Amino acid sequence: ELAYVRDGVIQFEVQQPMIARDGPHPVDQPVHNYMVKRIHKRSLSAAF
């Protein structure tokens, strides 16, 4: 039942490993950066 779906997006969330910094620093913030992955779709046919 691959054809009834209009569009498909498979989100695989990962966050980068951040390194802590030492010294007089403006301190760093992490982000929940979201990974969009919209799926494509095709079909192949043959006739006789």
Next chain:
Amino acid sequence: ELAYVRDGVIQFEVQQPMIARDGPHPVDQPVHNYMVKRIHKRSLSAAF
């Protein structure tokens, strides 16, 4: 409890061998040594 500590210090004492000689050369007597150290304080910090 580091924030309760001011200045970490260390000491060292070394003694080194000698050699017996002859001749008009000057006299000789053993040695003692004392080297004393400080520390370096820093901070790994983060944010979110």
